[PDB]
Ligand binder design. Sequence first.
Ligand SMILES: CNC(=O)c1cc(Cl)ccn1
Length: 100
Amino acid sequence: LTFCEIILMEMESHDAAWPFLEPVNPRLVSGYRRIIKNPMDFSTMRERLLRGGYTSSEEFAADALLVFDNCQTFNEDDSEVGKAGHIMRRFFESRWEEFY
Ligand SMILES: CNC(=O)c1cc(Cl)ccn1
């Protein structure tokens, strides 16, 4: 869970991390409530981590991949959020496989 802190901090401070810092506001994003069943962002993961709500690193990795799966589900690959999402997803997978 130490590395979970390291990689979350690096993700939170990443350049392309702007679409995933805060939860998506369904009032502002049309159809998001309908398309995405399990919304997830970095702050939600951050709150769960500080509270200690992560049993294992796998549960952490699950929510991380959930962020990028949700991004790919709702946004186009050539969209601004989509392009930022591909950067963040590749960043996570890379750093995650470095440690483990
Ligand atoms: C992760 N962010 C999104 O999925 C998103 C998508 C759109 Cl269209 C607007 C704001 N946020």
